[PDB]
Nucleic acid binder design. Structure first.
Lengths: 351, 88, 218
RNA sequence: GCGUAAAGCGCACGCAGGCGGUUUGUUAAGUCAGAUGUGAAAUCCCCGGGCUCAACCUGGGAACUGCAUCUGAUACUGGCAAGCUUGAGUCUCGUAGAGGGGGGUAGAAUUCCAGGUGUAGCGGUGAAAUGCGUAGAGAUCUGGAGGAAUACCGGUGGCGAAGGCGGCCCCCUGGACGAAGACUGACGCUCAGGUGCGAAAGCGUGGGGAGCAAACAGGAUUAGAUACCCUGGUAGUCCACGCCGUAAACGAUGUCGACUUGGAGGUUGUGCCCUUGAGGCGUGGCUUCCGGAGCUAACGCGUUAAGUCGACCGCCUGGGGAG
RNA sequence: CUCCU
């Protein structure tokens, strides 16, 4: 009657829009899809990756209750935005309590600064803070035992864009984005940003209080063109990214992501690039002037036809080595620019 | 363009009061004061066709109001065209 | 009453304007189906189901929806009724004259492959004739034991299986569907304004229909 | 019948003409009803009769769709009188806008001229040549002159009846829109003839002439090339005053008014509330797209209709000859 | 060439 009308305003009263009221009971689990029912229209297609805690395995069976989020309705069929963000609000509440407490005490362990402030991780999540926040004074946790246990004492938070730098060790001690866009600027300030949508040319990681970043396709990895960003990173995930460029007009901060496994390649050039170190490597495709061993984490094109034996020109590597086989090959040159290591195979015992 | 003191002067001069602003003698008097004002603007400038179309518009508006007033009350029609000064 | 499943209302803005009798625009720009009018229509549907199933008639259950897939098989094999849940073939009812011998291929092929030449020719031939059986099995499995034209069609989404409705309106089958807010209640005889995309709802509506069928068979 | 088949004036104003919101009273002109006179006879039609039947002749009627007069009816239309406010119009506040006319000014660039540095090419093409350059070109710098158009903003954005209107500032000036009231009281819509405005080209008079560019010259291309391409280059493009009065003047859709499911946007006002946050709910105007019924020969149109209707106007009647 | 939902 008005039973139903009253019933409706009752059910309005006993739900809210965000991920606040822990209501969805997990009513089917299957890898790789969780699904709940928080009194909304449909049932969420939950990833498994919003629900495994800190070492990789699941924590919640049938009947268990986490709130999710809302304010977005119907993309065709379905209901939600993920409950993991839910969690962010809880983290915010604890941070507020510390600010509110006047302080927040947990554990903060910060080994190093991607962009000038040690990284602090609380429970599952890891956050990035400005450089001062990690240490109370000039103590520096580089001399501390690695990934040490303290808490976090807050140094600085940016209040809009979420960057929090927190205080390790020293227990005793106790319009809007675009005018002053010089904070994360200077050349390479690393950031932790969640990606939003990957537009087949891009990835759109954008976190720092109402901005837009791209990390488009050219860097992303250490392969250029065949990459397809959906395969290589994620959807909705907080990553390694830094600015590389901010354009004042046109409002296009052009971030990057290759500032990572670039270092691995450098190590390969070095690590085994000290002089003439020997390597056990597997060939992948012999292209009539070489053999292309490509073991050791993405180091590209290698041994030329000129060595291969103690005969120069007549050899044709398909006749002499193999397809897909691990061999003797030592380094002989790493060229830092133009990304050419040039291994060899004549360094053996025939003469 | 026919400032507010001029319009209040003509409303109070031809109407009943400062509220009877939409009667026929008042509307004819405001259109006539406007036309006789714009004759100085079309004395020079000679080529403002987009404004002269507004002039011809309020000329025909004045003529249809005078045709209504001549049809209803010939007494105030003669008092208005003789008080105001028109008819070729 | 939102009894046990949550069947309150739907999508946002692309409502079919023929369903102006069932709307309440909520604060989140989402429609609320009039739940105090849903229940008389649902009872007017079940009062027909007891009649035509106590006729000893055949109900055909239709819903794919990627989520109401198993609720139709589970909630329809509990009765003595028949279902189509994976893929709706174009012309299973009005071209049933040629769907018939495809059913003969299914029954006449699992007859050969439960005991007969399911190993006697080639491992590749088992990989062909078996794959044929798993292709026809979740395409004709629920309609396999029917052997006739159905007397009713219970559609769970008019907007998703609108060609099954027009299909069984070329011929004289009384269809009835639970419609969404964006669905079209034109071919549907006994319209049920409610939730098409909730697993709770396709448990509730289809479960009460399942009670009216087997409880209705006297 | 008139978006594309033939057919909506290029767009307006506007006299005669046509049409007209709503209430009351009067009139009875239109309108309706009856009656009388008349509407010749023959002919058509009906029911009969006579020629042996029929054709034919003929009795009686009906009809002669009308006109005039008298008597009434007064719902509608019209005439007259008195109103009413919804249609229309006026006033008080603002609001946005490449709306128009006149005047002034700014920066970049192109061209030329004078000077400096400097020397062997420049320019152009699909390739080339004609052309310019050792008389110092092209480039680079400084200065000056003159003309024209206003990058970015620039927005299936804005304004205008249409044509159309883009730097910035001033002066004179038209229209639209909305909120709250007041005022007049049908003053309205359309409009043959008429009058006005009307891109570009062109014509006349007088200026001005950077860049571009018909004609024209030359080089190519080609079988030919009165062309496309290149190098030059005069009318014209610009201004002031007159004329011309046409355009694929196009939404190929006359104007005005009413009604009839939705969605996504743009732009421009405004009201309320927690402006407490770029917030939420409504409300007017103009406009873009997609689609519903309905319509259409289909394509498509689809609340800004090509849907349902009403008022007035223009136009079409096979193709060519022929606008 | 790379600024979307």
């Amino acid at each position: 009657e008005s039973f139903a009308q009253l019933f409706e305003e009752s059910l309005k009263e006993i739900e809210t829009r965000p991920g606040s009221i822990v209501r969805g009971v997990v009513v089917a689990i299957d890898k790789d899809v969780v699904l709940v029912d928080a009194g909304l229209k449909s049932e969420s297609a939950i990833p498994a990756e919003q629900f495994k805690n800190a070492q990789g395995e699941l924590e919640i069976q049938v009947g268990d209750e986490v709130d999710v989020a809302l304010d977005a309705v119907e993309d065709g069929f379905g209901e939600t935005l993920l409950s993991r963000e839910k969690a962010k609000r809880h983290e915010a509440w604890i941070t507020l309590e510390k600010a509110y407490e006047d302080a927040e005490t947990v554990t903060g362990v910060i080994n190093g600064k991607v962009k000038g402030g040690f990284t602090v991780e609380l429970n599952g999540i890891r956050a990035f803070l400005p450089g001062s926040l990690v240490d109370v004074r000039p103590v520096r946790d580089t001399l501390h035992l690695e990934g040490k246990e303290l808490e976090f004492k807050v140094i600085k938070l940016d209040q809009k864009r979420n960057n929090v730098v927190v205080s390790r060790r020293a227990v005793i001690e106790s319009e809007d984005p675009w005018v002053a866009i010089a904070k994360r600027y200077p050349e390479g300030t690393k950031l932790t940003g969640r990606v939003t949508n990957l537009t087949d040319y891009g990835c759109f990681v954008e976190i720092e209080e109402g901005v837009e970043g791209l990390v488009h396709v050219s860097e992303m990895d250490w392969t250029n063109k065949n990459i397809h960003p959906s395969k290589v990173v994620n959807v909705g995930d907080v990553v390694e990214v830094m600015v590389l460029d901010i354009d004042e007009e046109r409002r296009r901060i052009s971030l990057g992501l290759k500032q990572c496994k670039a270092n691995p390649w450098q190590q390969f050039a070095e690590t085994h690039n000290k002089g003439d170190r020997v390597e056990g490597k597997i060939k992948s495709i012999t292209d009539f002037g070489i053999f292309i061993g490509l073991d050791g984490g993405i180091d590209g094109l290698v041994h030329l036809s000129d060595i291969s034996w103690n005969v120069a020109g007549e050899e044709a590597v398909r006749e002499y080595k193999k397809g897909d086989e691990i061999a003797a090959v030592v380094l002989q040159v790493d060229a830092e620019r133009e990304r050419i290591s040039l291994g060899v195979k004549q360094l053996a015992e025939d003469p | 363009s026919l400032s507010t003191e001029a319009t209040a002067k003509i409303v109070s001069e031809f109407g009943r009061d400062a509220n009877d602003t939409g009667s026929t003698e008042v509307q004819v008097a405001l259109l006539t004061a406007q036309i006789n004002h714009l004759q100085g603007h079309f004395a020079e400038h000679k080529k403002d066709h987009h404004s002269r179309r507004g002039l011809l518009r309020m000329v025909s508006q004045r003529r249809k109001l005078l045709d209504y007033l001549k049809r209803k009350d010939v007494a105030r029609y003669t008092q208005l065209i003789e008080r105001l000064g028109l008819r070729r | 009453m939102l009894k046990a499943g949550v069947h309150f209302g739907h999508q946002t803005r692309y409502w079919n304007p023929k369903m102006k009798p069932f709307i309440f625009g909520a604060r989140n720009k989402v429609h609320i189906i009039n739940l105090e009018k849903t229940v008389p229509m649902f009872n007017e549907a079940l009062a027909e189901l007891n009649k035509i199933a106590s006729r000893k008639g055949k109900i055909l259950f239709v819903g794919t929806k990627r989520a109401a897939s198993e609720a139709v098989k589970d909630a329809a094999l509990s009765c003595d009724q028949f279902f189509v849940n994976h893929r709706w073939l174009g012309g299973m009812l009005t071209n049933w004259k040629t769907v018939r011998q495809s059913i003969k291929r299914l029954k006449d092929l699992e007859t050969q492959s439960q005991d007969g030449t399911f190993d006697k020719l080639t491992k590749k031939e088992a990989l062909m004739r078996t794959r044929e059986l798993e292709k026809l099995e979740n395409s004709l499995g629920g309609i396999k034991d029917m052997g006739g034209l159905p007397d009713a069609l219970f559609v769970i989404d008019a907007d998703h299986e609108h060609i099954a409705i027009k299909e069984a309106n070329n011929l004289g089958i009384p269809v009835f569907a639970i419609v969404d807010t964006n669905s079209d209640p034109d071919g549907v005889d006994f319209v049920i304004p409610g939730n098409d995309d909730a697993i709770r709802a396709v448990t509730l509506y289809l479960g009460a229909v399942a009670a009216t069928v087997r409880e209705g068979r006297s």
